[PDB]
Amino acid sequence: VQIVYKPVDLSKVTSKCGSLGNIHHKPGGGQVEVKSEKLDFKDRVQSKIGSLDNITHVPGGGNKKIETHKLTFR
Amino acid sequence: VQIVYKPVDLSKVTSKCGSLGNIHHKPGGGQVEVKSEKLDFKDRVQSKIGSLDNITHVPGGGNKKIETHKLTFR
Amino acid sequence: VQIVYKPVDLSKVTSKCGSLGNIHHKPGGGQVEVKSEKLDFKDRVQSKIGSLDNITHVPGGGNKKIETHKLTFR
Amino acid sequence: VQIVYKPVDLSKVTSKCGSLGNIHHKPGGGQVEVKSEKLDFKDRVQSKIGSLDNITHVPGGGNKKIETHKLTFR
Amino acid sequence: VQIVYKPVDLSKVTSKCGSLGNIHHKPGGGQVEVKSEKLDFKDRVQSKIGSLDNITHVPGGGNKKIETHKLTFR
Amino acid sequence: VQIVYKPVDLSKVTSKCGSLGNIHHKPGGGQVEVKSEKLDFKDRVQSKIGSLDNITHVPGGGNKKIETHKLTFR
Amino acid sequence: VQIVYKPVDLSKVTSKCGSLGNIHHKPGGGQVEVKSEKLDFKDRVQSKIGSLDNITHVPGGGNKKIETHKLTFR
Amino acid sequence: VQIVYKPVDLSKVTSKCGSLGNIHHKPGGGQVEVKSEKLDFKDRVQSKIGSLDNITHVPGGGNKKIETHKLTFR
Amino acid sequence: VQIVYKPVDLSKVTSKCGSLGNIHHKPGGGQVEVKSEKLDFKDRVQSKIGSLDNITHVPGGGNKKIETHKLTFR
Amino acid sequence: VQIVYKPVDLSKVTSKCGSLGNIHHKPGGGQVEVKSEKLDFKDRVQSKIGSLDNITHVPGGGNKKIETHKLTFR
């Protein structure tokens, strides 16, 4: 029983951008009304209730590598 | 019983952009009204209830590699 | 019993863009009204209830490679 | 019993675009009214209920390769 | 019992576009009214109920390769 | 020269209504596009140019008497 | 030369309404686009140019008497 | 030369309303775009240019009498 | 030359309303864009340019009498 | 030359209202953008340029009498 785990990974992620100019985020907010009474969350819940919200994201490169290696022997 | 796991991966993701000009995000917000009473979430729930929301995303390159390697021996 | 897993992968994703000009996202928001009483979510639910929402996405290259390698021995 | 998994993959995805000009997304929002009482979601549900929503996507290249390699030995 | 899996794949997807001019997406929204009471979704449901929605997509190249390789030995 | 102006006017306008029930005015608006260059209005002009508009009028009685008495001696 | 101006006016306007119930005015607005360059208005002009507008009028009685008495001696 | 101006005016305007119930004015606003360059108004001009606007009027009685008496001796 | 101006005016305006209930004015605002360069107003001009505006008027009785008496001797 | 100006005016304006209940004015504001360069106003101009504005008026009786008496001897 011989298991050889040898992932040869050569990877490059490259973003080339000269200049990012005028980014204008001007939002006139509104109205959010939320009515509830009983909220039950047990395990690993991500919940946003009644949000007015503004996200301006300007990453120079925004590159993301996700690598998962799982080996299980039963 | 011999298992040879040898994924030779050579990968390149390349975005070339000179300049990003005028990005204008001006939204006049409105009205969101949500009525509930009983909310039950058990396991691994992602829930957005009653949101007014504004996302401006300007990544220079926006490149994303997702690589999953799973080996299971039963 | 010999299993040789050798995926030779040479892949390139290339986006070349000189300049991105005027992107104008101006939306006049409206009205969203949602009435419920009892919401039950058990496992791995993604749910958006009562959203008014504005997404401006301007990636320089927007390239995404998804690679899944699964080997199972029973 | 010999299994040789050797996918030689040479692939290139190439988008060449000089300039992207005026993109104008101005939508006058309307009205969405949704009435329900009892919602039950068990496993792996993606549900959007009562949304008014605006998506402006201008990727420089928008190239996406999806590669799935599955080998199962029973 | 010898299985030789050797797909030699040489593939190129190429979009050449000089300039993309005026894209104008101005839609006057209307009215959507949806009435239900009991909704039951068990496994792997994708459901949109009561949406008014606006999608402007202008990818520079919009090229997508989908490759699935499945080998099963019983 | 004798002018006797004696209009004996006895007038009654009567509207009897018990109850006015559900009046529902929900119109999905559309699009109006009007192009002109030179507009000249001299005396007593009433002009509506490029209107999208919604009028809900529910008067309890809506009674209107118009009485004009003109006597001219030359 | 004798002018007797004696208009005996007895007038009653009567609206009787018990109750006015549900009046619902929910209009999804649209888009109005008006292009002009030169507008000249001299005397007593009433002009609405490029309006999106919503009027909900619920008068209890809405009764209007207009009475004009003009006597001119030349 | 004898002018007798004796308008005997007995007038009553009467609105009787028990109760005014639910008046709901919820309008999702839209978009108004107006382009002009040169506007010239000399005498007694009433002009609305580029308005998005919402008027909710609920007078208990809304009764209006307009009476004009003009006598001119030349 | 005898001018007798004796307008005997007996007038009553009466609004009787028991109770005014739920008046709900919730408007999701939109977007108004107005472009001009040169505006010339000489005498007695009433002008609204580029307004987004919300008027909720609930007078208990809303009764208005307008009476003009003009006598001119030349 | 005898001018007798004797307007006998007996007038009553009466609004009777028991109670005014829930008046709810919740407006989600939007966006107003106005561009001009040269504005010339000479005599008696009333002008509103670029306003977003909210007026809630709840007078108990809202009764207004306007009476103008003009006598001119040339």
Residue numbers in the entry:
A (entry chain H), B (entry chain D), C (entry chain B), D (entry chain F), E (entry chain J), F (entry chain I), ...: 306 to 379
Task: Quote the passages of the study that discuss this structure, keeping the authors' original sentences.
Alzheimer’s disease (AD) is the consequence of neuronal death and brain atrophy associated with the aggregation of protein tau into fibrils. The small molecule EGCG, abundant in green tea, has long been known to disaggregate tau and other amyloid fibrils, but EGCG has poor drug-like properties, failing to fully penetrate the brain. Here we have cryogenically trapped an intermediate of brain-extracted tau fibrils on the kinetic pathway to EGCG-induced disaggregation and have determined its cryoEM structure.
Reassuringly, our control map precisely matches previously published tau PHF maps. Three new densities alongside the PHF (Sites 1-3) were revealed in cryoEM maps of PHFs incubated with EGCG for 1- and 3-h. These new densities are not present in the map of our control, lacking EGCG. Moreover, the density attributed to tau exhibits the same backbone path at all time points. Our estimates are based on free energies calculated using coordinates of the control and 3-h structures. The results show that each tau molecule in the fibril is less stable after 3-h EGCG incubation (−28.1 kcal/mol/chain) compared to the no-EGCG structure (−34.9 kcal/mol/chain).
